[PDB]
Scaffold this active site. Sequence first.
Site, PDB file in Angstrom:
ATOM      1  N   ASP A  89       0.914  -1.172   0.000  1.00 37.36           N
ATOM      2  CA  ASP A  89       0.000   0.000   0.000  1.00 37.36           C
ATOM      3  C   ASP A  89       0.935   1.199   0.000  1.00 37.36           C
ATOM      4  O   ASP A  89       1.582   1.499   1.006  1.00 37.36           O
ATOM      5  CB  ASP A  89      -1.001  -0.025   1.203  1.00 37.36           C
ATOM      6  CG  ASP A  89      -1.919   1.134   1.222  1.00 37.36           C
ATOM      7  OD1 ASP A  89      -1.623   2.115   0.515  1.00 37.36           O
ATOM      8  OD2 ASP A  89      -2.919   1.121   1.987  1.00 37.36           O
ATOM      9  N   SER A 140       1.146  12.913 -15.029  1.00 35.30           N
ATOM     10  CA  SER A 140      -0.095  12.997 -15.803  1.00 35.30           C
ATOM     11  C   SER A 140       0.022  14.263 -16.642  1.00 35.30           C
ATOM     12  O   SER A 140       0.747  15.205 -16.248  1.00 35.30           O
ATOM     13  CB  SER A 140      -1.253  13.192 -14.882  1.00 35.30           C
ATOM     14  OG  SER A 140      -2.529  13.322 -15.501  1.00 35.30           O
ATOM     15  N   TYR A 169      -7.013  15.962  -8.132  1.00 33.46           N
ATOM     16  CA  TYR A 169      -6.153  15.047  -8.853  1.00 33.46           C
ATOM     17  C   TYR A 169      -4.974  15.779  -9.536  1.00 33.46           C
ATOM     18  O   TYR A 169      -3.806  15.403  -9.331  1.00 33.46           O
ATOM     19  CB  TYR A 169      -6.958  14.266  -9.862  1.00 33.46           C
ATOM     20  CG  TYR A 169      -6.104  13.394 -10.811  1.00 33.46           C
ATOM     21  CD1 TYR A 169      -5.741  12.135 -10.422  1.00 33.46           C
ATOM     22  CD2 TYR A 169      -5.758  13.806 -12.069  1.00 33.46           C
ATOM     23  CE1 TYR A 169      -4.977  11.297 -11.267  1.00 33.46           C
ATOM     24  CE2 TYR A 169      -5.028  12.989 -12.908  1.00 33.46           C
ATOM     25  CZ  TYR A 169      -4.666  11.745 -12.523  1.00 33.46           C
ATOM     26  OH  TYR A 169      -3.867  10.945 -13.351  1.00 33.46           O
ATOM     27  N   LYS A 210      -0.946  15.598  -8.876  1.00 30.57           N
ATOM     28  CA  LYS A 210      -0.027  15.275  -9.952  1.00 30.57           C
ATOM     29  C   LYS A 210       0.990  16.391 -10.219  1.00 30.57           C
ATOM     30  O   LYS A 210       2.149  16.101 -10.465  1.00 30.57           O
ATOM     31  CB  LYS A 210      -0.828  14.866 -11.192  1.00 30.57           C
ATOM     32  CG  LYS A 210      -1.497  13.495 -11.042  1.00 30.57           C
ATOM     33  CD  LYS A 210      -0.499  12.363 -10.985  1.00 30.57           C
ATOM     34  CE  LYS A 210      -1.228  10.993 -11.178  1.00 30.57           C
ATOM     35  NZ  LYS A 210      -0.151   9.961 -11.200  1.00 30.57           N
TER      36      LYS A 210
END
Lengths: 257, 257, 257, 257
Positions: free
Chosen positions: D60, D140, D153, D157
């Site tokens: 994890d 990304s 998000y 990133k």
Amino acid sequence: IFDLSGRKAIVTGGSKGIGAAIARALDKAGATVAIADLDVMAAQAVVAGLENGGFAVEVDVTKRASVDAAMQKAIDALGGFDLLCANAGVSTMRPAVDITDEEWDFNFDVNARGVFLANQIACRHFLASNTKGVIVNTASLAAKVGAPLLAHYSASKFAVFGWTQALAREMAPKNIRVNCVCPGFVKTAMQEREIIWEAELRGMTPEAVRAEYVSLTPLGRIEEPEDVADVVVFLASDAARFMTGQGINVTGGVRMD
Amino acid sequence: IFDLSGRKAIVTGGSKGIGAAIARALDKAGATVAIADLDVMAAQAVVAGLENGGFAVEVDVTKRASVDAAMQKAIDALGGFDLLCANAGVSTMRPAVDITDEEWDFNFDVNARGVFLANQIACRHFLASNTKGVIVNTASLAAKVGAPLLAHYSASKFAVFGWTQALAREMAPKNIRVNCVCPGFVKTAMQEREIIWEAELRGMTPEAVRAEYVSLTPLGRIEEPEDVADVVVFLASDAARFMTGQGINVTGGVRMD
Amino acid sequence: IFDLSGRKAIVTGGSKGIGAAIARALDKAGATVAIADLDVMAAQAVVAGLENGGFAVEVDVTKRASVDAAMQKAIDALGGFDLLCANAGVSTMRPAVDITDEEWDFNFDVNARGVFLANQIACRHFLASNTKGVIVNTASLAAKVGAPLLAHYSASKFAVFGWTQALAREMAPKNIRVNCVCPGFVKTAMQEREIIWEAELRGMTPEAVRAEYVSLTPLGRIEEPEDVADVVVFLASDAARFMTGQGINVTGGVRMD
Amino acid sequence: IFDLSGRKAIVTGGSKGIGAAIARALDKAGATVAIADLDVMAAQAVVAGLENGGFAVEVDVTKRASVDAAMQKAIDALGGFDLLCANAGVSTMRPAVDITDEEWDFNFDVNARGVFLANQIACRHFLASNTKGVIVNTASLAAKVGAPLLAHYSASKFAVFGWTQALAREMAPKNIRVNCVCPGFVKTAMQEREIIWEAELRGMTPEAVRAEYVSLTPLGRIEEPEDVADVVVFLASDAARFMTGQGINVTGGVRMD
Ligand SMILES: NC(=O)c1ccc[n+]([C@@H]2O[C@H](COP(=O)([O-])OP(=O)(O)OC[C@H]3O[C@@H](n4cnc5c(N)ncnc54)[C@H](O)[C@@H]3O)[C@@H](O)[C@H]2O)c1
Ligand SMILES: NC(=O)c1ccc[n+]([C@@H]2O[C@H](COP(=O)([O-])OP(=O)(O)OC[C@H]3O[C@@H](n4cnc5c(N)ncnc54)[C@H](O)[C@@H]3O)[C@@H](O)[C@H]2O)c1
Ligand SMILES: NC(=O)c1ccc[n+]([C@@H]2O[C@H](COP(=O)([O-])OP(=O)(O)OC[C@H]3O[C@@H](n4cnc5c(N)ncnc54)[C@H](O)[C@@H]3O)[C@@H](O)[C@H]2O)c1
């Protein structure tokens, strides 16, 4: 996927320096390379060491008629045409207030116009033969960060990058890719000239100017032509099939984008 | 603090469009403005409306002798010189494969060379008078993103931004600041031409093209020259005293840096 | 057009440094300012000197309940809400291999989460009242260039910038602008302390470290909080009405975008 | 120069999508690969098919104890450690005003913290063994442009890229390179999910959302995992020996830097 076997390449400014390292690397990767250069004798010497043979042709990339004729002769010799690496470039160094129109034009005509003409003519050929052609232009660190004493040079290399982006947007629907590489402080004859101009203008020794370049570089050393060439092979290859319009930095950590 | 009271400005390409807005905005902020432009009568009409008076002088920014003479005539008329806004620019639109050398040179000579010349000459003046002079250049969204059908224009505007950065680095130790602005879809005569050219090239109505520009703009409206002009005032002013070498986007959200 | 007369502002982290300078500049420009800060006595000290009144409120920007209550109390006190300056931030300098989870979280929760919560709740308020609201977030030069010894700090400030861009895209169609400012090497009362710590980590003297920051700055001096605050005024004002999603550098030439 | 024969790699998040394609491509290039993933069943299934052996381990990435144990187990199984590709990531889509603290944390803890932990622990290992180690992080397109409905998000990133740059600068003197790749619209389960969420939030069909992504891509097709993985191979390789701290776009021309 990094293989260039069977591909036919033209490298402008391939006689010396970064261009010669590009030609050698493309060849090592499987390509057959034509070198188009102001110095066609030096081009033949490079061709002599290539594994897949090759061709040397004289060109003055500032002149459309010359580029058209050189490209056609190379394409004829190669028996096809898949890849252009437009590498020919020049620099002069001068405080901004003293830059002459003559050297503004020298920098622009070789660095920007020379890329334009080679690229434009390349794309015409690719489109006429329905080829998924690939272009790699040599820009500079100075296409990303304006450099003092190189303001005109910087402007000309920003122009390369902008041309690259726009061309890429037009060529992508035609499956033609167009990228550029942005080298840092590369040990070639252009660097050896620059350290001496720079030292004089800043009142330093050549040695100290050199050391400053290395101190600026996170990877801790001056760059080699091969450091750039192996990245151009990547961008030419199908490993880079989903990449277009980029200014890939190859600077040892100087510039991050 | 955004006051320009007592400052002496020259605006190239100030007769119309963004440059005319810049002249009006600098004058509203307290400056006295000289407009240097191909179109001297339109310049004189803008000057007629200004609060602090001003001057109109003919110039062709592509020519060094013209820029030298027009800048000297302006500085003489103004009685000083603190601020240059180099705004003159042109475009043509063409598929990249079809760009002519003539239109390549037209875009570079106005957009890039004209900035070079006006800036270089301004900096000579600032240094000779020991003035903490300021430069604002008008670049373009196309100095940040290469635009299809505008590959040569983009290259020329990238060159402005690169020039701006490099000059800024040289001028900063002299306390002379140099920045540029990058506008989006500004409704001027240039937009009207481009809409038509793009309509023609893509088989659209000019109105559909214009609507697409708005659709691409987060703030949801076509841009006005005044949108740009107020940012040029900021960059001219002492509120921007710790800012140099930037390309400030004024695009309504289209481009973010 | 640069006036903030009648505007109602909240500044998070306004008690000291850049935030205090922001509050003072906003007030000077016409706004009425509420300062939300962990140290409410220090907030009240800033408010005490403002021309247009104002309000001080306790906040812990890491906790949503705290931010919601502070923001609501501030809006109530102001009688309106036009502008949020999200300034609260912290740093710890550490070699990347020694960064603890605690230091990671400290940086993210204040710098990135704090901006998220303040901005999200501001936007909820602006949208509920149909306000053409403005946000200015304080990012950093380290939102543009990752900085050694500040790897977690840089990550957190990159996050602020990315947040700013995405939020600006969502908010633009609702007539709400969201920008950030990216300061350079700013002299605050804390920097005596953070320079000694850097000097210790780098095996240098504190003097040598401070001098290097000057050397690295084209404009030739250490930055002051006021250098930043004045640009925040601009971004808050209607002069910036056609700008959104930007990371405006205020670094003295260190970073150019 | 593109060969990874003999090298020992760890890919976090290698069970499916881009990560699995990375693990396959590294293996094809000659590496032995350990996959560390939250879904160890799926990782084992990928590892089973690799040419050069390999190892699957459960991790994890949001938890330092998990990462430390998983990496040690991997290094022990591989007998060495040359390369980390930190790929694990998650997303949720939500209007910025509705983002929950829980989903903010999910995105940050995986995407940013998970790269931090993997990278930090990797460097510890490299330094202790005097290894010319290499890191490739998966960022990304949203590390370059903030994306509406993905503001959290995007912020996470951005963080990955800023971490990447800062860590690169610290590690470059020690012969360790750290880069990231910024993929575009890649067809995996993240995309099948997102296409649905986005379609619901925007009032469109899933097909139309997907079509819009293609329309926005100059190369004119949706991206595949393999488009990204092959560039990762290049960045891992010695062909990229003079590149560090980069965010290499692999977007089909959507984003150019
Ligand atoms: N050395 C560096 O640090 C460095 C850094 C960044 C970019 N670059 C760029 O890399 C490219 C090559 O640089 P280099 O250092 O190898 O320089 P170089 O001077 O070693 O080589 C230049 C090559 O270009 C050719 N050339 C020059 N003018 C030409 C013309 N008009 N027509 C045809 N060929 C011509 C030369 O004959 C020569 O083979 C240039 O684009 C340059 O600006 C160099
Ligand atoms: N309209 C847009 O969307 C837009 C966008 C970005 C950038 N720009 C840039 O902004 C600047 C102003 O553009 P505009 O839209 O206001 O165009 P415009 O055509 O309305 O105005 C152009 C001005 O420049 C002057 N000019 C042109 N060539 C000149 C020369 N050789 N010497 C002196 N003056 C000359 C013209 O006479 C005119 O007064 C240009 O640099 C342009 O590239 C415009
Ligand atoms: N368009 C796209 O699909 C796209 C675009 C840009 C970036 N990305 C990024 O690429 C990477 C892979 O995306 P994908 O589309 O292949 O997604 P995916 O959802 O198909 O795969 C995610 C992988 O990460 C693993 N993972 C999730 N949480 C984890 C944890 N806490 N610890 C360890 N492993 C964990 C999963 O088990 C799975 O193997 C991510 O970083 C994602 O943000 C994807």
